[PDB]
Amino acid sequence: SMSYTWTGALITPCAAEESKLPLSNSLLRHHNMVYATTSRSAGLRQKKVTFDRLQVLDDHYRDVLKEMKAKASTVKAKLLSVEEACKLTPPHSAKSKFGYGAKDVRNLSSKAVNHIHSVWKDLLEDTVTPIDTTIMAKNEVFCVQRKPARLIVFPDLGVRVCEKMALYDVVSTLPQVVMGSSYGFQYSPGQRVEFLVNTWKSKKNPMGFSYDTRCFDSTVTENDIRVEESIYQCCDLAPEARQAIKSLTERLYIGGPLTNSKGQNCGYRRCRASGVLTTSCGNTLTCYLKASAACRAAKLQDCTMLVNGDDLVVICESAGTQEDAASLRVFTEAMTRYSAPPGDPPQPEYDLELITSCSSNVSVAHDASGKRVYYLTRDPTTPLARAAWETARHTPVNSWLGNIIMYAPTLWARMILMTHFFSILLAQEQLEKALDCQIYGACYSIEPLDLPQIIERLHGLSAFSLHSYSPGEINRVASCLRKLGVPPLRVWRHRARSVRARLLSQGGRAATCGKYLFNWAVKTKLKLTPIPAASQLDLSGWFVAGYSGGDIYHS
Ligand SMILES: CN1CCN(c2cc3c(cc2F)c(=O)c(-c2noc(Cc4ccccc4)n2)cn3Cc2ccc(C(F)(F)F)cc2F)CC1
């Protein structure tokens, strides 16, 4: 079965697309290296993601599936009311083709609610007719060496709300129960590091590897998608939920027709849709299932998995370098049979720091006392490129804010992102202005002035005093700054001292940002005690589940 079939109709934009970087130069001067993907490259992506999938299952697969269902059976899940579902809808979510928008949904306008009721009722009465989806090219920023745009497939606003009602509770609670500690989205960055470091430490003689499935969404078969449903259905559910879940699966999740922005039929999908509520959960369960089975086929000893959607990292007991090399090829052959072939082949690693998963890795620094501290970091190229874009253009999603929150302990986030953006917020007098950012796919509204206590709550006080970073980490940053033409430490330190001073003179939370975020920039350090406001912060539903493509909004 083909993941996609196409009519020949083009994937079209719904607005003018910028692929070019037009204050921003002060951040990064090699602006010709920064580009954004557009629909013009859609054809290239279409070719990559269109192929025949072959799948052969074995006893290991079946044993693991049985084990997952058994745990899934302990879960009780609730229907969301229409109101609860509406409030989860982002204010700028794509409007319905049926005469109402996200604002109408959020306001609970009777037109929107009446339509949502009719969609739900239709779901219960009809469990066959494929549901329409829109296919678009994503507009994302990168640095050269060029990626063709990613494709986004999503149903109408009315359907998405119904998805929330039927499955939000399921995709928010089920994965963690089924996969336990292996479920990646339950962790803040600090917690993700702790689990990785400790898992590594716990092996007698550890070996680990990241596994990249080539175009994971396309590798997901209709069988895979029904297997996921069978897992959902193990939950203790209301008869209405079971019916809706079954209808959504047959009518939307397993596949359906693709319609472009102009309304033309572009083709038909028979794999994972990137823009539905179950994408993250489905991908995570499916990746976990196949990888767990593959471990057994490959006879990897004491396999420990960490899974985030299609992102997979494995840490096990080494059986020797040659033996490991051979075991990994077997693991890969098993994954391939399950319809999850690798992009670039996995390779054994024997240094935790060298394992990149979720585009990030663990590294070491030292706190004020000289004590060792592990933190999550990544190559800063993309974050910096997108930071430049967001400086030179108005964008609804502030990746820089999300990056500061997730990578606050890193040298590059502290040195560059905090300095550059707080300087801009000072000039524009928009310190008090709340901004939208994404965490694990979900959209959050956050006040930049709260960053100190947010960071203390997530990464601890040491985040404000990390030094003596690894040479490997610094070389990567330096190499990146060279590549992108970014000013060196001496320049950012000078800028940071200026911003820090200006922040202090405003007092209040502003001064707190100056004192904590920029203590690194001053030669005589302040004392930095626990921020009292860091305790009374509501940081519960931040790191519970993934929702990439799931159209979720919180707070
Ligand atoms: C061959 N290798 C070359 C470099 N290598 C290293 C250089 C380092 C550090 C560790 C290294 F191994 C380190 O640990 C700190 C530091 N610690 O504490 C703060 C304070 C601080 C905190 C937060 C933000 C900024 C400064 N800065 C500073 N530098 C100097 C440095 C060089 C290059 C870059 C950059 F990458 F930008 F080119 C940035 C740097 F800082 C050793 C030998």
Could you give the topology of this structure?
Blueprint: E1 4-6, E2 34-36, H1 42-49, H2 59-72, H3 82-87, H4 102-107, H5 110-125, E3 133-137, E4 141-143, E5 151-154, H6 157-179, H7 189-202, E6 206-212, H8 216-219, H9 222-232, H10 239-253, E7 256-259, E8 265-269, H11 279-297, E9 301-308, E10 311-317, H12 321-337, E11 361-366, E12 372-377, H13 381-392, H14 399-406, H15 411-427, E13 435-439, E14 442-446, H16 451-459, H17 471-484, H18 489-504, H19 508-517
Parallel strand pairs: 3-7
Antiparallel strand pairs: 1-8, 2-4, 3-5, 6-10, 7-8, 9-10, 11-12, 13-14
Helix pairs in contact: 2-6, 2-11, 5-6, 6-10, 6-11, 9-10, 11-12, 14-15, 15-18, 18-19
This protein binds ligand KLI.
Residues 411, 414-415, 467-469, 471, 474, 477-478, 481, 488-489, 520 line the site of the ligand CN1CCN(c2cc3c(cc2F)c(=O)c(-c2noc(Cc4ccccc4)n2)cn3Cc2ccc(C(F)(F)F)cc2F)CC1.
Structural overview:
It is found in: Host cell membrane; Host cytoplasm, Host perinuclear region; Host endoplasmic reticulum membrane; Host lipid droplet. Residues 206-324 form the RdRp catalytic domain. Belongs to the hepacivirus polyprotein family. This is Genome polyprotein. It comes from Hepatitis C virus genotype 1b. It is classed as hydrolase/hydrolase inhibitor. By secondary structure, the protein is α+β, with helices and mostly antiparallel strands. It folds into four domains: 1-52 and 130-155 and 255-270, no CATH class; 53-129 and 156-179 and 221-254 and 271-277, no CATH class; 180-220 and 278-358, 2-Layer Sandwich (Alpha-Beta Plaits); 359-555, no CATH class. Helices cover 43% and strands 13% of the residues. It is built from 19 helices and 14 strands. It has helices at residues 42-49, 59-72, 82-87, 102-107, 110-125, 157-179, 189-202, 216-219, 222-232, 239-253, 279-297, 321-337, 381-392, 399-406, 411-427, 451-459, 471-484, 489-504, 508-517; strands at 4-6, 34-36, 133-137, 141-143, 151-154, 206-212, 256-259, 265-269, 301-308, 311-317, 361-366, 372-377, 435-439, 442-446. The chain has a five-stranded mixed sheet. It has a three-stranded antiparallel sheet with strand order 6-10-9, sandwiched between helices. A two-stranded antiparallel sheet has the order 2-4. A hairpin with a 2-residue loop joins strand 13 and strand 14 (442-446). Helix 5 (110-125) crosses helix 6, helix 9 packs antiparallel against helix 10 (239-253) and helix 11 packs across helix 12 (321-337). The structure holds the ligand CN1CCN(c2cc3c(cc2F)c(=O)c(-c2noc(Cc4ccccc4)n2)cn3Cc2ccc(C(F)(F)F)cc2F)CC1.
